[PDB]
mmCIF file of C-alpha atoms and ligand atoms in Angstrom:
data_model
loop_
_atom_site.group_PDB
_atom_site.id
_atom_site.type_symbol
_atom_site.label_atom_id
_atom_site.label_comp_id
_atom_site.label_asym_id
_atom_site.label_seq_id
_atom_site.Cartn_x
_atom_site.Cartn_y
_atom_site.Cartn_z
ATOM 1 C CA UNK R 1370 -24.566 -31.075 20.164
ATOM 2 C CA UNK R 1371 -27.048 -32.018 17.673
ATOM 3 C CA UNK R 1372 -27.286 -35.828 18.037
ATOM 4 C CA UNK R 1373 -26.100 -38.585 19.809
ATOM 5 C CA UNK R 1374 -23.111 -39.744 18.220
ATOM 6 C CA UNK R 1375 -21.418 -36.949 18.395
ATOM 7 C CA UNK R 1376 -21.765 -37.604 22.158
ATOM 8 C CA UNK R 1377 -20.800 -40.867 21.785
ATOM 9 C CA UNK R 1378 -17.280 -39.888 19.124
ATOM 10 C CA UNK R 1379 -17.579 -37.098 22.366
ATOM 11 C CA UNK R 1380 -17.196 -39.630 25.013
ATOM 12 C CA UNK R 1381 -14.770 -42.131 22.815
ATOM 13 C CA UNK R 1382 -12.153 -39.119 21.616
ATOM 14 C CA UNK R 1383 -12.245 -38.503 25.599
ATOM 15 C CA UNK R 1384 -10.271 -41.818 26.002
ATOM 16 C CA UNK R 1385 -13.880 -43.654 26.698
ATOM 17 C CA UNK R 1386 -12.804 -47.907 25.511
ATOM 18 C CA UNK R 1387 -14.463 -51.306 26.291
ATOM 19 C CA UNK R 1388 -17.648 -50.756 28.415
ATOM 20 C CA UNK R 1389 -20.742 -52.123 29.800
ATOM 21 C CA UNK R 1390 -23.549 -51.008 31.274
ATOM 22 C CA UNK R 1391 -25.893 -52.079 34.042
ATOM 23 C CA UNK R 1392 -28.945 -51.148 34.359
ATOM 24 C CA UNK R 1393 -31.289 -50.802 37.956
ATOM 25 C CA UNK R 1394 -34.889 -49.636 37.705
ATOM 26 C CA UNK R 1395 -37.152 -47.678 40.275
ATOM 27 C CA UNK R 1396 -39.883 -50.035 40.511
ATOM 28 C CA UNK R 1397 -41.775 -47.362 44.142
ATOM 29 C CA UNK R 1398 -45.998 -47.357 44.203
ATOM 30 C CA UNK R 1399 -44.585 -43.401 44.033
ATOM 31 C CA UNK R 1400 -44.158 -43.703 40.357
ATOM 32 C CA UNK R 1401 -48.325 -43.723 40.637
ATOM 33 C CA UNK R 1402 -48.132 -39.815 41.303
ATOM 34 C CA UNK R 1403 -45.040 -38.693 39.728
ATOM 35 C CA UNK R 1404 -46.130 -37.811 36.491
ATOM 36 C CA UNK R 1405 -48.372 -35.303 37.276
ATOM 37 C CA UNK R 1406 -46.486 -32.260 36.597
ATOM 38 C CA UNK R 1407 -43.676 -33.924 34.239
ATOM 39 C CA UNK R 1408 -45.343 -36.943 32.163
ATOM 40 C CA UNK R 1409 -49.776 -35.338 31.986
ATOM 41 C CA UNK R 1410 -50.843 -36.885 35.017
ATOM 42 C CA UNK R 1411 -50.074 -40.210 34.125
ATOM 43 C CA UNK R 1412 -47.937 -43.011 35.671
ATOM 44 C CA UNK R 1413 -44.157 -42.780 34.774
ATOM 45 C CA UNK R 1414 -44.470 -46.504 34.091
ATOM 46 C CA UNK R 1415 -47.596 -46.541 32.209
ATOM 47 C CA UNK R 1416 -47.145 -48.755 28.979
ATOM 48 C CA UNK R 1417 -48.762 -46.699 25.528
ATOM 49 C CA UNK R 1418 -48.189 -46.385 22.616
ATOM 50 C CA UNK R 1419 -44.901 -43.173 23.548
ATOM 51 C CA UNK R 1420 -42.139 -44.491 25.276
ATOM 52 C CA UNK R 1421 -43.018 -42.834 29.654
ATOM 53 C CA UNK R 1422 -39.629 -40.875 31.187
ATOM 54 C CA UNK R 1423 -37.794 -44.740 31.445
ATOM 55 C CA UNK R 1424 -38.493 -46.151 28.698
ATOM 56 C CA UNK R 1425 -37.586 -42.854 27.200
ATOM 57 C CA UNK R 1426 -33.874 -42.205 29.415
ATOM 58 C CA UNK R 1427 -32.959 -46.173 28.661
ATOM 59 C CA UNK R 1428 -32.801 -45.047 25.254
ATOM 60 C CA UNK R 1429 -31.369 -42.391 24.967
ATOM 61 C CA UNK R 1430 -27.934 -43.605 27.217
ATOM 62 C CA UNK R 1431 -28.257 -47.059 25.679
ATOM 63 C CA UNK R 1432 -27.661 -45.813 22.311
ATOM 64 C CA UNK R 1433 -24.928 -43.216 23.001
ATOM 65 C CA UNK R 1434 -23.390 -46.284 25.145
ATOM 66 C CA UNK R 1435 -23.865 -49.317 22.127
ATOM 67 C CA UNK R 1436 -20.374 -48.375 21.003
ATOM 68 C CA UNK R 1437 -18.658 -48.854 23.509
ATOM 69 C CA UNK R 1438 -19.665 -52.678 24.568
ATOM 70 C CA UNK R 1439 -19.171 -55.326 21.044
ATOM 71 C CA UNK R 1440 -22.448 -57.854 22.150
ATOM 72 C CA UNK R 1441 -23.941 -54.918 24.274
ATOM 73 C CA UNK R 1442 -24.736 -57.096 27.487
ATOM 74 C CA UNK R 1443 -26.569 -55.335 29.920
ATOM 75 C CA UNK R 1444 -26.761 -56.747 33.352
ATOM 76 C CA UNK R 1445 -30.895 -55.437 33.991
ATOM 77 C CA UNK R 1446 -32.229 -55.378 37.782
ATOM 78 C CA UNK R 1447 -35.351 -54.022 38.825
ATOM 79 C CA UNK R 1448 -35.621 -52.814 42.641
ATOM 80 C CA UNK R 1449 -38.223 -50.609 44.634
ATOM 81 C CA UNK R 1450 -41.613 -53.316 44.103
ATOM 82 C CA UNK R 1451 -42.825 -55.780 46.298
ATOM 83 C CA UNK R 1452 -40.046 -58.247 45.825
ATOM 84 C CA UNK R 1453 -37.651 -56.565 46.666
ATOM 85 C CA UNK R 1454 -38.905 -53.233 48.524
ATOM 86 C CA UNK R 1455 -35.708 -51.967 49.939
ATOM 87 C CA UNK R 1456 -33.789 -54.421 50.115
ATOM 88 C CA UNK R 1457 -33.008 -55.988 47.465
ATOM 89 C CA UNK R 1458 -33.239 -56.573 43.213
ATOM 90 C CA UNK R 1459 -34.796 -58.500 41.010
ATOM 91 C CA UNK R 1460 -33.255 -59.534 37.140
ATOM 92 C CA UNK R 1461 -35.697 -58.795 34.400
ATOM 93 C CA UNK R 1462 -34.579 -62.303 32.765
ATOM 94 C CA UNK R 1463 -34.418 -65.715 34.699
ATOM 95 C CA UNK R 1464 -31.457 -66.900 36.656
ATOM 96 C CA UNK R 1465 -29.928 -63.762 36.278
ATOM 97 C CA UNK R 1466 -30.335 -63.901 32.159
ATOM 98 C CA UNK R 1467 -27.734 -59.859 30.880
ATOM 99 C CA UNK R 1468 -30.294 -58.324 28.722
ATOM 100 C CA UNK R 1469 -29.282 -58.389 24.974
ATOM 101 C CA UNK R 1470 -28.712 -54.726 23.928
ATOM 102 C CA UNK R 1471 -31.260 -51.564 25.954
ATOM 103 C CA UNK R 1472 -33.426 -52.828 22.790
ATOM 104 C CA UNK R 1473 -34.585 -56.033 24.642
ATOM 105 C CA UNK R 1474 -34.018 -53.794 28.197
ATOM 106 C CA UNK R 1475 -36.792 -51.804 27.002
ATOM 107 C CA UNK R 1476 -38.763 -55.033 25.671
ATOM 108 C CA UNK R 1477 -38.583 -57.469 28.655
ATOM 109 C CA UNK R 1478 -39.533 -54.111 30.486
ATOM 110 C CA UNK R 1479 -42.828 -53.828 28.730
ATOM 111 C CA UNK R 1480 -43.712 -57.922 29.831
ATOM 112 C CA UNK R 1481 -42.811 -56.908 33.653
ATOM 113 C CA UNK R 1482 -44.131 -53.892 34.586
ATOM 114 C CA UNK R 1483 -47.452 -54.878 35.105
ATOM 115 C CA UNK R 1484 -47.079 -57.709 36.323
ATOM 116 C CA UNK R 1485 -45.149 -55.778 39.602
ATOM 117 C CA UNK R 1486 -47.040 -54.346 42.158
ATOM 118 C CA UNK R 1487 -45.236 -50.513 42.654
ATOM 119 C CA UNK R 1488 -44.395 -50.827 46.406
ATOM 120 C CA UNK R 1489 -40.998 -48.957 48.686
ATOM 121 C CA UNK R 1490 -39.160 -48.000 50.511
ATOM 122 C CA UNK R 1491 -36.381 -46.267 48.156
ATOM 123 C CA UNK R 1492 -32.811 -46.894 48.070
ATOM 124 C CA UNK R 1493 -30.151 -47.074 46.143
ATOM 125 C CA UNK R 1494 -28.111 -49.740 48.935
ATOM 126 C CA UNK R 1495 -28.974 -52.880 46.982
ATOM 127 C CA UNK R 1496 -28.213 -51.927 42.899
ATOM 128 C CA UNK R 1497 -25.198 -50.486 43.868
ATOM 129 C CA UNK R 1498 -24.192 -53.579 45.587
ATOM 130 C CA UNK R 1499 -25.586 -55.769 43.220
ATOM 131 C CA UNK R 1500 -23.284 -54.047 40.161
ATOM 132 C CA UNK R 1501 -20.309 -53.872 43.057
ATOM 133 C CA UNK R 1502 -20.891 -57.622 42.389
ATOM 134 C CA UNK R 1503 -21.099 -57.898 38.782
ATOM 135 C CA UNK R 1504 -18.181 -55.306 38.103
ATOM 136 C CA UNK R 1505 -15.770 -58.110 41.060
ATOM 137 C CA UNK R 1506 -16.788 -61.257 38.752
ATOM 138 C CA UNK R 1507 -16.072 -59.869 35.794
ATOM 139 C CA UNK R 1508 -12.513 -59.591 36.612
ATOM 140 C CA UNK R 1509 -12.315 -55.466 37.395
ATOM 141 C CA UNK R 1510 -14.067 -54.522 33.616
ATOM 142 C CA UNK R 1511 -15.291 -51.166 33.948
ATOM 143 C CA UNK R 1512 -18.896 -50.661 34.617
ATOM 144 C CA UNK R 1513 -21.529 -47.971 34.225
ATOM 145 C CA UNK R 1514 -24.011 -48.272 36.750
ATOM 146 C CA UNK R 1515 -26.720 -46.029 35.629
ATOM 147 C CA UNK R 1516 -29.801 -45.573 37.956
ATOM 148 C CA UNK R 1517 -33.294 -44.909 36.932
ATOM 149 C CA UNK R 1518 -35.238 -43.284 39.902
ATOM 150 C CA UNK R 1519 -38.769 -41.563 39.859
ATOM 151 C CA UNK R 1520 -37.660 -40.459 43.877
ATOM 152 C CA UNK R 1521 -34.229 -39.524 46.724
ATOM 153 C CA UNK R 1522 -33.774 -41.793 49.822
ATOM 154 C CA UNK R 1523 -36.034 -42.868 52.082
ATOM 155 C CA UNK R 1524 -36.035 -40.540 55.128
ATOM 156 C CA UNK R 1525 -37.980 -41.196 57.197
ATOM 157 C CA UNK R 1526 -37.735 -38.840 60.031
ATOM 158 C CA UNK R 1527 -35.541 -37.469 62.073
ATOM 159 C CA UNK R 1528 -33.962 -32.618 60.329
ATOM 160 C CA UNK R 1529 -30.752 -32.794 63.171
ATOM 161 C CA UNK R 1530 -28.586 -34.607 61.138
ATOM 162 C CA UNK R 1531 -28.924 -37.549 60.790
ATOM 163 C CA UNK R 1532 -29.027 -40.453 58.356
ATOM 164 C CA UNK R 1533 -32.291 -42.114 57.145
ATOM 165 C CA UNK R 1534 -31.209 -46.506 57.221
ATOM 166 C CA UNK R 1535 -31.909 -45.737 53.941
ATOM 167 C CA UNK R 1536 -30.076 -43.272 52.895
ATOM 168 C CA UNK R 1537 -26.706 -44.733 55.563
ATOM 169 C CA UNK R 1538 -26.576 -47.831 53.323
ATOM 170 C CA UNK R 1539 -26.664 -45.898 50.310
ATOM 171 C CA UNK R 1540 -24.095 -43.305 51.152
ATOM 172 C CA UNK R 1541 -21.997 -46.579 52.362
ATOM 173 C CA UNK R 1542 -23.080 -48.481 49.255
ATOM 174 C CA UNK R 1543 -21.459 -45.588 47.429
ATOM 175 C CA UNK R 1544 -18.364 -44.944 48.551
ATOM 176 C CA UNK R 1545 -17.880 -48.587 48.928
ATOM 177 C CA UNK R 1546 -18.000 -48.787 45.675
ATOM 178 C CA UNK R 1547 -15.537 -46.269 44.808
ATOM 179 C CA UNK R 1548 -12.299 -49.576 45.239
ATOM 180 C CA UNK R 1549 -13.665 -50.890 42.328
ATOM 181 C CA UNK R 1550 -13.230 -49.730 38.293
ATOM 182 C CA UNK R 1551 -17.146 -48.695 38.500
ATOM 183 C CA UNK R 1552 -18.559 -45.521 37.435
ATOM 184 C CA UNK R 1553 -22.578 -44.238 39.258
ATOM 185 C CA UNK R 1554 -25.230 -42.587 37.267
ATOM 186 C CA UNK R 1555 -28.551 -41.899 39.409
ATOM 187 C CA UNK R 1556 -30.662 -40.375 36.896
ATOM 188 C CA UNK R 1557 -34.180 -38.797 38.238
ATOM 189 C CA UNK R 1558 -37.341 -38.688 36.271
ATOM 190 C CA UNK R 1559 -40.572 -37.892 36.867
ATOM 191 C CA UNK R 1560 -41.563 -34.723 39.290
ATOM 192 C CA UNK R 1561 -39.345 -35.313 42.327
ATOM 193 C CA UNK R 1562 -38.367 -33.480 44.129
ATOM 194 C CA UNK R 1563 -35.238 -33.371 43.351
ATOM 195 C CA UNK R 1564 -33.755 -30.295 45.291
ATOM 196 C CA UNK R 1565 -32.226 -32.323 48.311
ATOM 197 C CA UNK R 1566 -30.074 -33.733 45.960
ATOM 198 C CA UNK R 1567 -27.306 -32.449 45.163
ATOM 199 C CA UNK R 1568 -27.285 -31.528 48.791
ATOM 200 C CA UNK R 1569 -26.754 -34.707 49.236
ATOM 201 C CA UNK R 1570 -23.854 -36.151 47.430
ATOM 202 C CA UNK R 1571 -22.561 -33.237 49.396
ATOM 203 C CA UNK R 1572 -22.479 -35.353 52.365
ATOM 204 C CA UNK R 1573 -21.304 -38.352 50.367
ATOM 205 C CA UNK R 1574 -17.764 -39.356 53.001
ATOM 206 C CA UNK R 1575 -14.333 -39.059 50.713
ATOM 207 C CA UNK R 1576 -13.359 -41.280 47.806
ATOM 208 C CA UNK R 1577 -10.472 -41.728 45.954
ATOM 209 C CA UNK R 1578 -12.387 -41.090 43.117
ATOM 210 C CA UNK R 1579 -15.646 -39.359 41.937
ATOM 211 C CA UNK R 1580 -16.967 -42.040 41.845
ATOM 212 C CA UNK R 1581 -21.247 -40.559 42.017
ATOM 213 C CA UNK R 1582 -23.254 -38.567 39.146
ATOM 214 C CA UNK R 1583 -26.241 -36.958 39.770
ATOM 215 C CA UNK R 1584 -28.487 -36.553 36.178
ATOM 216 C CA UNK R 1585 -32.379 -34.868 36.191
ATOM 217 C CA UNK R 1586 -33.728 -35.654 33.021
ATOM 218 C CA UNK R 1587 -37.086 -34.035 34.053
ATOM 219 C CA UNK R 1588 -35.447 -30.554 34.002
ATOM 220 C CA UNK R 1589 -33.885 -31.085 29.784
ATOM 221 C CA UNK R 1590 -36.872 -32.510 28.473
ATOM 222 C CA UNK R 1591 -39.024 -29.783 29.958
ATOM 223 C CA UNK R 1592 -36.480 -26.889 28.726
ATOM 224 C CA UNK R 1593 -38.402 -24.925 25.155
ATOM 225 C CA UNK R 1594 -36.000 -26.247 22.678
ATOM 226 C CA UNK R 1595 -36.258 -29.273 19.393
ATOM 227 C CA UNK R 1596 -36.495 -33.253 20.923
ATOM 228 C CA UNK R 1597 -32.855 -33.622 19.281
ATOM 229 C CA UNK R 1598 -30.955 -30.842 21.535
ATOM 230 C CA UNK R 1599 -32.241 -32.312 24.747
ATOM 231 C CA UNK R 1600 -31.635 -35.797 24.099
ATOM 232 C CA UNK R 1601 -28.520 -34.575 23.681
ATOM 233 C CA UNK R 1602 -28.320 -32.386 26.384
ATOM 234 C CA UNK R 1603 -29.918 -35.570 28.209
ATOM 235 C CA UNK R 1604 -26.824 -38.325 27.259
ATOM 236 C CA UNK R 1605 -23.675 -35.493 27.964
ATOM 237 C CA UNK R 1606 -24.591 -34.674 31.265
ATOM 238 C CA UNK R 1607 -25.804 -37.962 32.187
ATOM 239 C CA UNK R 1608 -21.804 -39.271 30.361
ATOM 240 C CA UNK R 1609 -19.790 -36.298 30.112
ATOM 241 C CA UNK R 1610 -17.726 -37.227 33.411
ATOM 242 C CA UNK R 1611 -17.900 -40.731 32.740
ATOM 243 C CA UNK R 1612 -13.822 -41.073 30.570
ATOM 244 C CA UNK R 1613 -12.338 -39.173 33.314
ATOM 245 C CA UNK R 1614 -13.375 -41.188 35.859
ATOM 246 C CA UNK R 1615 -12.241 -44.255 33.799
ATOM 247 C CA UNK R 1616 -8.979 -42.846 33.500
ATOM 248 C CA UNK R 1617 -9.430 -42.334 37.542
ATOM 249 C CA UNK R 1618 -9.468 -46.453 37.557
ATOM 250 C CA UNK R 1619 -6.400 -47.131 35.493
ATOM 251 C CA UNK R 1620 -4.547 -44.265 38.009
ATOM 252 C CA UNK R 1621 -5.837 -46.113 40.718
ATOM 253 C CA UNK R 1622 -4.972 -49.977 38.844
ATOM 254 C CA UNK R 1623 -8.351 -50.759 40.370
ATOM 255 C CA UNK R 1624 -9.172 -52.127 36.197
ATOM 256 C CA UNK R 1625 -8.270 -55.447 35.537
ATOM 257 C CA UNK R 1626 -8.506 -55.996 38.953
ATOM 258 C CA UNK R 1627 -10.697 -58.253 41.350
ATOM 259 C CA UNK R 1628 -11.304 -57.076 45.410
ATOM 260 C CA UNK R 1629 -11.316 -59.930 46.822
ATOM 261 C CA UNK R 1630 -13.393 -58.572 49.930
ATOM 262 C CA UNK R 1631 -17.034 -57.668 47.648
ATOM 263 C CA UNK R 1632 -19.729 -59.891 49.195
ATOM 264 C CA UNK R 1633 -21.849 -61.847 46.289
ATOM 265 C CA UNK R 1634 -25.490 -61.001 45.889
ATOM 266 C CA UNK R 1635 -28.283 -62.270 44.878
ATOM 267 C CA UNK R 1636 -30.796 -60.908 43.077
ATOM 268 C CA UNK R 1637 -34.334 -62.828 43.544
ATOM 269 C CA UNK R 1638 -36.162 -63.519 40.210
ATOM 270 C CA UNK R 1639 -38.092 -61.758 37.950
ATOM 271 C CA UNK R 1640 -41.930 -61.407 39.284
HETATM 272 MG MG1 MG Q 864 -19.153 -57.457 26.023
HETATM 273 MG MG1 MG Q 865 -39.642 -43.033 44.399
#
């Protein structure tokens, strides 16, 4: 495809209807160096006059999905900074006020970044748990959770086939989320590594439907072709499987139904 528009129309013809976007941003301290090869020895969270990789990912995906929400309200969270670590997420806005389209996700982000202290370690359990509450409170409406991160879930130290506590909770959160009408997209930005990644998806337990997808933003953005086509490939690789998961949610009677056993997660305020 040559534009995001062709991608947008491709989701639409594949059966995609109303879809609410949720964004979670990685604020781990590794973002200082993971831009070594991929972002010219700059911090991934560097704010200049060019968009950094988080800003690019947000822009491309927010644009491709803008058509599927009338109000474009995007619940927007950070995690991995000093206030949250691997335990919580924080709202971009006070009182967990959702963002107005990706453009307010973008502007609000740049305001927030230089007021953080990047921390760690890395778990996606809190952001996934957060998106589950939002889905449940929405009354079972279809959501796409897009997680944008610069590394895989923290594994401190135990080859002999055991899971780190972060891995365990993340994998638990992914499986548990398959009970809801929700698609989870992990976007990998920066140098990574992202090698051990679809061997990770190999150890996610069986689910009613395949609610999880990893996409490597860096890898795509590195190929030798027009900026447009890189952007199209990323949008498509990120989202090509979401219509099929949306249908899955219908055939399992998840949509429009409330689950009843989803604990209410609360977001820390923006720092
Ligand atoms: Mg809406
Ligand atoms: Mg990291």
